[PDB]
């Protein structure tokens, strides 16, 4: 394995950092290869695939982009309110193609979406809404509950002919400030927090994920999570940078029959590589409980699974044991479970376990962990408690444990606030100048010897994650 974007430990972008340039490249050299597939379980139970090749994907992207360039201006924000299907990605990439700031959200009519859609739209004030014909009515209804002066143009992406792309203008190469999209994430503030993720942020973090998971050509990506999610888009954005196709289903499709995700994770005949996917802790439990094939099932081979990214709350030892007990007999490698630390402020990925290692879980003093120190004890101990690792910090980014008040790096084992830095870090919160400075632009005033900030410059900006944790024995631990 070798990362095509890394040269001498440095992330190099020869063909720019435009993910638009990457998609167009595949559309030119492998236009007839599969790019994106949506497993539709709305009608049938084993699902019918909706496919979209690289050239087809480009055709739809440029068509929507051309329409957006007629009704929006550079700097405008375009909210994506499609149902979870192919048209969602068409809309999202379409907004990027148009040279506008995408805002990945959700169809209001779709159930199981957590987020204050009203307050979010209040924050970014989009000039256009992207949806589908099937959902356009529900969208128009939702906006009737909003003031008249904030009911922006609604565009059904599937209603835009392919030949519209004829007038599409490719936006000039973006610098390091050009915002690709706004990623809104959970918070307790009244005004929702939308991380400004630049094209440089996107490309950098995708590369950092590729490096961490040893992603290659031949590796296909899979996801069931809603696109509006801290880890909802990363696997999809992986496909254009790596050149292999991405497969997805609705969240509800997974909840109904989690075996569908297990099946798609499994080896297909013709596979030259592994499967990469994402699943929070509860998803592992749900799959282990309801996603194991009945007796008499067709062969299930999970020996191909490369990485299932699991974030961001610490994975349970009980969950790890249960999932391996359930799918281990089907060939599932324990090392495929990749516990990780991630957040929207860093685009997503910050740390995960090494490629050849299983989830590291250690037994530490329960109350000493409460006193702010990580100390290993025996399993027999009455003060014993299991604590799972978040692995090691990815390439071209740093994480440090600091004393929050004095901005001073702490010795290993000691719990403090986690500060992070790198080119994947967002450039602020939309519409929150002061909150942006406070969170994204901190200076590290003191380092230990050795330091976890080794490689970072003095004027490197550090992100106050708000999370607390500690380094222990070469691994990062999130404790709060």
Author numbering: 3 to 482
Provide the authors' own sentences about this structure as they appear in the paper.
FadD32 is one of the 34 FadD proteins of M. tuberculosis annotated as putative fatty acyl-CoA synthetases, and its role in mycolic acid biosynthesis is to activate C48–C64 meromycolic acid for condensation by PKS1313. FadD32 belongs to the adenylating enzyme superfamily that includes acyl-CoA synthetases, the adenylation domains of nonribosomal peptide synthetases, and firefly luciferases. These enzymes consist of two domains and catalyze two half-reactions: an adenylate-forming reaction which leads to formation of acyl-AMP from a carboxylate substrate and ATP, and a thioester-forming reaction which leads to formation of acyl-CoA from acyl-AMP and CoA or formation of acyl-ACP from acyl-AMP and ACP15. Although FadD32 was initially found to catalyze only the first half-reaction and was named fatty acyl-AMP ligase (FAAL), later evidence demonstrated that it is a bifunctional enzyme: during mycolic acid biosynthesis FadD32 catalyzes both the formation of meromycoloyl-AMP from meromycolic acid and ATP and the subsequent acyl chain transfer from meromycoloyl-AMP to the phosphopantetheinyl arm of the N-terminal ACP domain of PKS131617.
As our own initial studies indicated that MtFad32 tended to aggregate, we decided to crystallize FadD32 from M. smegmatis (MsFadD32), which has 74% sequence identity to MtFadD32. We determined the structures of apo N-MsFadD32 and ATP-bound MsFadD32 at 2.4 Å and 2.25 Å resolution by molecular replacement. ITC results showed that ATP bound to full-length MsFadD32 with a Kd value of approximately 36 μM, while AMP (control) did not bind to the protein; Moreover, the N-terminal domain of MsFadD32 (N-MsFadD32) alone could not bind ATP. Superposition of the structures of the apo and ATP-bound MsFadD32 revealed conformational changes within the N-terminal domain. Firstly, to accommodate the adenine moiety of ATP, the side-chain hydroxyl of Ser314, which forms a hydrogen bond with the main-chain carbonyl oxygen of Gly344 in the apo state, rotates 180°. Secondly, the side-chain carboxylate of Asp232, which forms a hydrogen bond with the side-chain hydroxyl of Thr187 in the apo state, rotates approximately 90° to make room for the α-phosphate of ATP. Thirdly, the P-loop moves a relatively large distance (5–7 Å) to stabilize the three phosphate groups of ATP. Of note, the conformational change in the P-loop is accompanied by the extension of a neighboring α-helix where Arg118, which in the apo state forms hydrogen bonds with Thr191 and Arg192, forms hydrogen bonds with Thr187 in the ATP-bound state.
